[PDB]
Amino acid sequence: FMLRVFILYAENVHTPDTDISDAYCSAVFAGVKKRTKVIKNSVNPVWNEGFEWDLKGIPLDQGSELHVVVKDHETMGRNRFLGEAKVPLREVLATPSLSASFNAPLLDTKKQPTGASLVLQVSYTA
Structure with a gap:
């Protein structure tokens, strides 16, 4: 009935030509975009x-x-844009717990790693 997602944190986030990073995360599912705070x-x-x-x-x-x-x-x-990942929700349908965690490297537009990673948790629940 619902997809529940916990965006916990990102590590090694570096913004080009800036000294310190000011980051937020954008998540899109079911045609609905949600955003974390900055x-x-x-x-x-x-x-x-x-x-x-x-x-x-x-x-x-x-x-x-x-x-x-x-x-x-x-x-x-x-x-x-700092980096992006596509997380496969098939992993959620893979065990009875109907949940999965991801520690996913963020990729640039060339789909190559940025050095940064994003930690999230996903759950399929009623």
């Missing part, structure tokens, strides 16, 4: 935020993916 001045931002997607009747299948993007609010309306 953590000012941090290489290891701890958002510790819970998100709940009403799946509006759509169940997960094995192609389902949660898209997460970390961005700096050096820049606002424009992006300041």
Whole structure:
């Protein structure tokens, strides 16, 4: 019935041409974008935020993916894309616990690592 996601933190976050990182996380599922708050001045931002997607009747299948993007609010309306990951929700459907944790490297637009990583927890619950 719902996808529950806990965005805990990111590590080694570095914004190009800035001394300190001002990062927030953008998550999109079921056509719904949710955002964490911005953590000012941090290489290891701890958002510790819970998100709940009403799946509006759509169940997960094995192609389902949660898209997460970390961005700096050096820049606002424009992006300041720092890195992104696609987390495979098939792993959630893989054990009876209907939950999975991810420690996912963030990739650039060339889909190559940024050095930063994002830690999150995902749960499929009624």
